[PDB]
């Protein structure tokens, strides 16, 4: 019933963060996702070069 | 779980290395066979058989 | 959170919660899109090897 629950529920689902997780984990998780994106880009570039 | 994730990343790195080396080795084999077919069988040996 | 997702210090004068959810969805889509590209690239590579 908290005023911002509906909005943040939507944000958790968008970043694939489970609802049972502590709210303090949201920024760390998003940071890791960005890290993963960088890694995937690097892998794609390496593979494209190898091909 | 953390250990298995680290193992996964290591294995992935090894797999990528092997996928990089394997096509080059195939190309070297193909190059040798091409030499045997074009320079030895169609040219050198064919001339010998005729004479 | 908005700064972490948008990267661009573009001092947007007005940050909305709807905008925040959209930028978060984009990151997830970018990761999904990158994984799909990698998979395609892996198929291309596999075809070449075959």
Swiss-Prot record, chain C:
Residue ranges that the Swiss-Prot or TrEMBL entry lists as coiled coil: 15-46
Transmembrane segments: none
Superkingdom to which the source organism belongs: Eukaryota
Cell compartments where the protein resides: Cytoplasm, Cytoskeleton, Microtubule organizing center, Centrosome; Cytoplasm, Cytoskeleton, Spindle
Complex formation: Component of the HAUS augmin-like complex. The complex interacts with the gamma-tubulin ring complex and this interaction is required for spindle assembly.
Described function: Contributes to mitotic spindle assembly, maintenance of centrosome integrity and completion of cytokinesis as part of the HAUS augmin-like complex.
Protein family: Belongs to the HAUS3 family.
Protein name from the UniProt record: HAUS augmin-like complex subunit 3
Residue range from the parent sequence: 449 to 498 of 597
